[PDB]
Design a binder for this molecule. Sequence first.
Ligand SMILES: [Ca+2]
Length: 223
Amino acid sequence: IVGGYTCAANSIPYQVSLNSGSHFCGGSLINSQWVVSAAHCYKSRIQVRLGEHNIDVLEGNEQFINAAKIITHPNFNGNTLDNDIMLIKLSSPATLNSRVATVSLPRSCAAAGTECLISGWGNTKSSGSSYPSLLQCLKAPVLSDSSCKSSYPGQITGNMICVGFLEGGKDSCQGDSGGPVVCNGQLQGIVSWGYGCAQKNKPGVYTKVCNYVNWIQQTIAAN
Ligand SMILES: [Ca+2]
Protein backbone atom coordinates (compact mmCIF):
# COMPACT_ATOMS: atom_id res chain seq x y z
CA ILE A 1 0.00 0.00 0.00
CA VAL A 2 1.53 3.27 -1.23
CA GLY A 3 0.42 6.52 0.32
CA GLY A 4 -1.58 4.82 3.06
CA TYR A 5 -1.25 4.69 6.84
CA THR A 6 -0.50 2.00 9.40
CA CYS A 7 -3.80 0.35 10.42
CA ALA A 8 -4.51 0.09 14.12
CA ALA A 9 -3.61 -3.41 15.27
CA ASN A 10 -6.29 -5.97 14.29
CA SER A 11 -8.63 -3.20 13.09
CA ILE A 12 -9.07 -5.03 9.71
CA PRO A 13 -9.92 -8.39 11.26
CA TYR A 14 -10.91 -10.08 7.95
CA GLN A 15 -7.45 -9.43 6.46
CA VAL A 16 -5.25 -12.53 6.12
CA SER A 17 -1.67 -13.06 5.01
CA LEU A 18 -0.95 -15.96 2.66
CA ASN A 19 2.42 -17.47 3.59
CA SER A 20 4.57 -20.12 1.94
CA GLY A 21 7.71 -19.48 3.93
CA SER A 22 7.13 -15.76 3.88
CA HIS A 23 4.18 -13.48 3.20
CA PHE A 24 3.37 -13.29 -0.53
CA CYS A 25 -0.29 -12.22 -0.93
CA GLY A 26 -3.33 -11.11 1.00
CA GLY A 27 -6.84 -12.45 1.28
CA SER A 28 -10.16 -11.92 3.04
CA LEU A 29 -12.03 -14.19 5.48
CA ILE A 30 -15.64 -14.53 4.29
CA ASN A 31 -16.88 -17.25 6.66
CA SER A 32 -15.17 -19.29 9.36
CA GLN A 33 -13.79 -21.77 6.81
CA TRP A 34 -13.20 -19.82 3.56
CA VAL A 35 -10.88 -17.10 2.30
CA VAL A 36 -11.21 -15.10 -0.94
CA SER A 37 -7.98 -14.13 -2.73
CA ALA A 38 -6.62 -13.76 -6.27
CA ALA A 39 -5.98 -16.66 -8.59
CA HIS A 40 -2.65 -15.12 -9.60
CA CYS A 41 -1.61 -15.80 -5.96
CA TYR A 42 -2.08 -19.54 -6.45
CA LYS A 43 0.44 -21.93 -4.96
CA SER A 44 -0.06 -25.64 -4.36
CA ARG A 45 0.51 -25.24 -0.57
CA ILE A 46 -0.45 -22.15 1.44
CA GLN A 47 -0.59 -21.32 5.13
CA VAL A 48 -3.24 -18.73 5.99
CA ARG A 49 -2.25 -16.33 8.76
CA LEU A 50 -5.16 -14.63 10.51
CA GLY A 51 -5.09 -12.13 13.37
CA GLU A 52 -1.88 -10.51 12.15
CA HIS A 53 -0.66 -6.99 12.66
CA ASN A 54 3.16 -7.25 12.64
CA ILE A 55 3.77 -10.17 10.30
CA ASP A 56 7.33 -10.53 11.58
CA VAL A 57 6.60 -10.85 15.31
CA LEU A 58 4.32 -13.12 17.32
CA GLU A 59 1.91 -10.85 19.21
CA GLY A 60 -0.61 -13.32 20.63
CA ASN A 61 -3.66 -13.13 18.34
CA GLU A 62 -2.37 -15.00 15.29
CA GLN A 63 -3.99 -18.07 13.86
CA PHE A 64 -1.85 -20.07 11.38
CA ILE A 65 -4.08 -22.48 9.45
CA ASN A 66 -3.15 -24.53 6.43
CA ALA A 67 -5.26 -24.34 3.28
CA ALA A 68 -6.97 -27.72 2.78
CA LYS A 69 -8.43 -26.67 -0.59
CA ILE A 70 -7.00 -24.09 -2.99
CA ILE A 71 -9.50 -23.47 -5.81
CA THR A 72 -8.99 -21.05 -8.68
CA HIS A 73 -11.64 -19.89 -11.09
CA PRO A 74 -11.58 -22.47 -13.91
CA ASN A 75 -11.32 -19.77 -16.59
CA PHE A 76 -8.71 -17.60 -14.89
CA ASN A 77 -6.31 -16.29 -17.53
CA GLY A 78 -2.82 -15.51 -16.30
CA ASN A 79 -2.12 -13.07 -19.12
CA THR A 80 -5.22 -10.90 -19.14
CA LEU A 81 -5.84 -11.57 -15.43
CA ASP A 82 -9.53 -12.07 -16.27
CA ASN A 83 -11.37 -14.01 -13.53
CA ASP A 84 -8.63 -13.29 -10.97
CA ILE A 85 -10.31 -15.02 -8.05
CA MET A 86 -9.36 -17.90 -5.77
CA LEU A 87 -11.11 -19.61 -2.85
CA ILE A 88 -9.25 -21.26 0.01
CA LYS A 89 -10.88 -23.68 2.43
CA LEU A 90 -9.15 -23.82 5.77
CA SER A 91 -8.11 -27.17 7.20
CA SER A 92 -9.90 -26.19 10.42
CA PRO A 93 -12.29 -23.31 11.09
CA ALA A 94 -10.92 -19.96 12.15
CA THR A 95 -11.87 -18.96 15.72
CA LEU A 96 -13.88 -15.77 15.40
CA ASN A 97 -13.42 -12.97 17.94
CA SER A 98 -12.80 -9.25 17.90
CA ARG A 99 -9.45 -9.69 16.13
CA VAL A 100 -10.38 -12.43 13.60
CA ALA A 101 -13.73 -11.71 11.93
CA THR A 102 -15.51 -12.28 8.64
CA VAL A 103 -16.42 -9.75 5.98
CA SER A 104 -19.59 -9.96 3.89
CA LEU A 105 -19.83 -10.60 0.17
CA PRO A 106 -21.41 -7.68 -1.72
CA ARG A 107 -25.17 -7.35 -2.01
CA SER A 108 -24.73 -5.31 -5.20
CA CYS A 109 -21.82 -3.94 -7.17
CA ALA A 110 -20.39 -0.69 -5.82
CA ALA A 111 -21.33 2.57 -7.48
CA ALA A 112 -18.65 4.91 -8.76
CA GLY A 113 -17.50 7.21 -5.96
CA THR A 114 -18.13 4.67 -3.20
CA GLU A 115 -15.47 4.97 -0.48
CA CYS A 116 -13.48 1.80 0.23
CA LEU A 117 -10.69 0.58 2.49
CA ILE A 118 -7.80 -1.33 0.83
CA SER A 119 -5.22 -3.07 2.98
CA GLY A 120 -2.12 -5.18 2.87
CA TRP A 121 1.56 -5.79 3.55
CA GLY A 122 2.72 -5.03 0.02
CA ASN A 123 5.23 -2.55 -1.29
CA THR A 124 4.85 0.97 0.14
CA LYS A 125 6.89 2.82 -2.53
CA SER A 126 5.74 4.23 -5.84
CA SER A 127 9.31 3.72 -7.13
CA GLY A 128 11.61 0.96 -5.92
CA SER A 129 10.44 -1.30 -3.11
CA SER A 130 10.09 -1.39 0.64
CA TYR A 131 7.97 -3.97 2.50
CA PRO A 132 6.33 -3.20 5.85
CA SER A 133 6.04 -5.29 8.96
CA LEU A 134 2.78 -3.63 10.03
CA LEU A 135 -0.48 -3.81 8.08
CA GLN A 136 -1.14 -0.76 5.91
CA CYS A 137 -4.51 0.81 5.09
CA LEU A 138 -5.72 3.16 2.32
CA LYS A 139 -9.07 4.91 1.85
CA ALA A 140 -9.92 5.11 -1.84
CA PRO A 141 -12.98 5.46 -4.08
CA VAL A 142 -14.39 3.26 -6.85
CA LEU A 143 -13.76 4.87 -10.25
CA SER A 144 -16.13 4.81 -13.19
CA ASP A 145 -15.86 2.10 -15.78
CA SER A 146 -15.28 4.80 -18.38
CA SER A 147 -12.33 6.22 -16.39
CA CYS A 148 -10.90 2.75 -15.85
CA LYS A 149 -11.03 1.99 -19.58
CA SER A 150 -9.49 5.36 -20.46
CA SER A 151 -6.56 4.56 -18.14
CA TYR A 152 -6.14 1.03 -19.53
CA PRO A 153 -7.39 0.92 -23.14
CA GLY A 154 -8.29 -2.59 -24.27
CA GLN A 155 -7.37 -4.16 -20.90
CA ILE A 156 -10.48 -3.84 -18.70
CA THR A 157 -12.98 -6.66 -18.84
CA GLY A 158 -16.40 -6.73 -17.28
CA ASN A 159 -14.80 -8.53 -14.32
CA MET A 160 -12.51 -5.65 -13.36
CA ILE A 161 -13.00 -2.37 -11.48
CA CYS A 162 -10.62 0.55 -10.87
CA VAL A 163 -10.32 1.97 -7.33
CA GLY A 164 -8.02 4.78 -6.25
CA PHE A 165 -6.79 8.09 -7.58
CA LEU A 166 -5.83 9.31 -11.03
CA GLU A 167 -3.46 11.91 -9.54
CA GLY A 168 -0.95 9.32 -8.42
CA GLY A 169 0.55 8.73 -5.02
CA LYS A 170 -2.02 6.36 -3.45
CA ASP A 171 -2.57 2.74 -4.56
CA SER A 172 -2.07 -0.91 -3.71
CA CYS A 173 1.04 -2.67 -5.02
CA GLN A 174 2.76 -6.03 -5.32
CA GLY A 175 2.35 -8.03 -2.13
CA ASP A 176 -1.08 -6.60 -1.56
CA SER A 177 -2.41 -8.89 -4.33
CA GLY A 178 -5.36 -11.02 -3.32
CA GLY A 179 -6.25 -8.67 -0.46
CA PRO A 180 -9.44 -6.75 0.24
CA VAL A 181 -11.23 -3.73 -1.11
CA VAL A 182 -14.08 -3.28 1.40
CA CYS A 183 -16.80 -0.66 0.93
CA ASN A 184 -19.77 -0.22 3.31
CA GLY A 185 -18.95 -3.53 4.96
CA GLN A 186 -18.81 -5.54 1.71
CA LEU A 187 -15.89 -7.08 -0.15
CA GLN A 188 -16.20 -5.42 -3.55
CA GLY A 189 -12.67 -5.87 -4.89
CA ILE A 190 -9.64 -8.16 -4.80
CA VAL A 191 -6.20 -6.57 -5.35
CA SER A 192 -5.32 -7.75 -8.86
CA TRP A 193 -3.04 -5.65 -11.07
CA GLY A 194 -2.00 -2.23 -12.28
CA TYR A 195 0.70 -0.46 -14.29
CA GLY A 196 3.41 0.08 -11.75
CA CYS A 197 2.11 1.39 -8.45
CA ALA A 198 0.60 4.77 -7.61
CA GLN A 199 1.46 6.27 -11.00
CA LYS A 200 -0.53 9.14 -12.52
CA ASN A 201 -3.58 7.98 -14.50
CA LYS A 202 -2.82 4.32 -13.67
CA PRO A 203 -5.16 3.44 -10.81
CA GLY A 204 -5.33 0.01 -9.27
CA VAL A 205 -7.35 -2.69 -11.02
CA TYR A 206 -9.35 -5.09 -8.86
CA THR A 207 -11.40 -8.22 -9.41
CA LYS A 208 -15.08 -7.26 -9.42
CA VAL A 209 -16.32 -9.54 -6.62
CA CYS A 210 -20.04 -8.97 -7.26
CA ASN A 211 -19.74 -10.93 -10.50
CA TYR A 212 -18.59 -14.04 -8.56
CA VAL A 213 -20.87 -14.42 -5.57
CA ASN A 214 -22.86 -17.20 -7.28
CA TRP A 215 -19.65 -19.03 -8.20
CA ILE A 216 -18.54 -18.70 -4.56
CA GLN A 217 -21.74 -20.23 -3.16
CA GLN A 218 -21.65 -23.09 -5.72
CA THR A 219 -18.01 -23.81 -4.95
CA ILE A 220 -18.63 -23.82 -1.19
CA ALA A 221 -21.62 -26.12 -1.67
CA ALA A 222 -19.52 -28.61 -3.64
CA ASN A 223 -16.71 -28.63 -1.07
CA1 LIG B 1 2.40 -11.29 14.08
